[PDB]
Amino acid sequence: PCELLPVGVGHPVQAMLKSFTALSGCASRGTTSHPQEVHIINLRKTAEVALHLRPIQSLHVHQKPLVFILNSPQPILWKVRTEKLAPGVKRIFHVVEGSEVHFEVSKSCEVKVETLPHGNEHLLNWAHHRYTAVTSFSELRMAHDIYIKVGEDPVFSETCKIDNKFLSLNYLASYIEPQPSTGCVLSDHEQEVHIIELQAPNSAFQVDVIVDLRPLDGDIPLHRDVVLLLKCEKSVNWVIKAHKVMGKLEIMTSDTVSLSEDTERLMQVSKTVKQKLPAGSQALIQWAEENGFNPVTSYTNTPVANHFNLRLRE
Numbered sequence: 001p002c003e004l005l006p007v008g009v010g011h012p013v014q015a016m017l018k019s020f021t022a023l024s025g026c027a028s029r030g031t032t033s034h035p036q037e038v039h040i041i042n043l044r045k046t047a048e049v050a051l052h053l054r055p056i057q058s059l060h061v062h063q064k065p066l067v068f069i070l071n072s073p074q075p076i077l078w079k080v081r082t083e084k085l086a087p088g089v090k091r092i093f094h095v096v097e098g099s100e101v102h103f104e105v106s107k108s109c110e111v112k113v114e115t116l117p118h119g120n121e122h123l124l125n126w127a128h129h130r131y132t133a134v135t136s137f138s139e140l141r142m143a144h145d146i147y148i149k150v151g152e153d154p155v156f157s158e159t160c161k162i163d164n165k166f167l168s169l170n171y172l173a174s175y176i177e178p179q180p181s182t183g184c185v186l187s188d189h190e191q192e193v194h195i196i197e198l199q200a201p202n203s204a205f206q207v208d209v210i211v212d213l214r215p216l217d218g219d220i221p222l223h224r225d226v227v228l229l230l231k232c233e234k235s236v237n238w239v240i241k242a243h244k245v246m247g248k249l250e251i252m253t254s255d256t257v258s259l260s261e262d263t264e265r266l267m268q269v270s271k272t273v274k275q276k277l278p279a280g281s282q283a284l285i286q287w288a289e290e291n292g293f294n295p296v297t298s299y300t301n302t303p304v305a306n307h308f309n310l311r312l313r314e
Contacts, residue, residue: 002184002281002299012216012298012312013196015179015305020172023139024120026160027168030133032152036065036090037135039148039171042123043072044141046098054083056151056170066091066150069127071116075099085150120162134160136171143173176307183300184281190247192297192312193227195284199303201236208258209306213242216311223247224312226267227293229284230255231277242266245312252277252291 007013023044031037043049051070055062063086070078075098082104090108093101094116101111117123120139127134135152137160149170201207209232215222221244230238230253237256242249242263249267251257252275259269278287281299288296302308 002186002285004182004184004281004299004301007181007183007300011181011183011300012185012310013181013183013194013300014309014311015181015300015302016307016309017177017179017202017305018307019175019177021141021143021175022167022171022173023141024162024164025136025138025166025168025171026162027136027153027156027166027170028134028158028160029152029154029156030158030160031135034131034133036067036131037150037152038067038069038127038131038133039135039150040069040123040127040137041071041146042120042137042139043070043076043143044139045073047072047074047076048079049076049143050079050081050145052081052083052145052147053085054149055085056149056153058153059151060084061086062150063089064151065089067094067131068092069094069116069123070096070099070101071118071123072096072099073118078102080104124160124162136160136168137162138171138173140173141175143175146173147171179302179305181300181302183298185298186285187295187297190223191225191227193229193288193293193295194297194310195229195281195288195299196231196308197279197281197284197299197301198232198236198305199301200234201232201306202304206235206237206256207306208239209236209308210239210241211308211310213240213245213263213310213312215244216313218244220244220314221246222312222314226250226312227288228252229277229288229293231279231284250293
């Protein structure tokens with residue numbers, strides 16, 4: 001009695017794809033002997049971007065003058081959020097026409113509108129003409145939030161040589177995109193059994209696929225037993241993150257399973273034993289019903305995702 005269909009917003013399982021948007025970059029300690037730090041962001045395709053700023057781990061407070069060169073193909077409204085950045089310090093922002101910068105405030109700070117080149121090397125050259133040395137360069141495929149850790153890190157060489165394989169935890173951007181699925185809702189004894197069949201987690205091997213478990217409500221914690229049948233064509237590590245749900249948790253899969261500390265505390269997780277599950281909705285619902293997991297609540301088939309939001313009834 002499972003009529004498989006493209007799922008709607010009410011389906012209990014909602015798939016998402018999380019990704020880091022870095023394309024290329026560099027970092028340098030070469031600004032140490034210069035009066036200011038220069039950080040370049042080169043964004044690729046009104047748009048709003050939150051720019052989170054904090055010092056590198058080896059610094060308690062950051063007080064060195066800052067220069068941000070914020071390049072984008074279309075205008076952007078920048079929202080600057082800072083933590084442990086000393087007030088009253090001269091911080092400059094170079095943006096494109098139509099772009100603006102807003103802060104969580106006039107005190108040694110200005111926004112300059114520029115004509116900026118689009119090529120990475122040309123933008124780096126534009127910066128070298130105004131400042132002798134640059135602290136970081138990050139080319140990004142887009143983003144909702146950009147996280148920059150300011151300060152001259154000693155691990156870096158003296159120059160900024162852009163590299164398409166460069167990655168620093170100091171300069172990161174995150175993007176989360178909802179993904180479509182097919183599936184069906186079928187239905188008891190304060191238990192829910194959910195079958196998630198993922199075709200691909202993104203060819204990055206043994207990557208994490210998060211299963212986030214919460215009440216649909218969000219304000220009221222639930223007493224519910226949960227059974228998860230997790231199947232993937234590729235090798236994945238299923239990461240279980242339960243919130244505001246207490247009960248038995250049974251996981252059926254041939255893959256490895258990581259449990260969050262909150263999950264092990266909230267729920268009574270049965271020792272996961274590797275289960276060889278069949279493929280397809282028909283064979284998976286039948287397997288569940290034959291191994292004492294009755295009734296099945298839902299089945300979800302997802303072509304691509306590395307994050308699932310499972311919301312339990314009431």
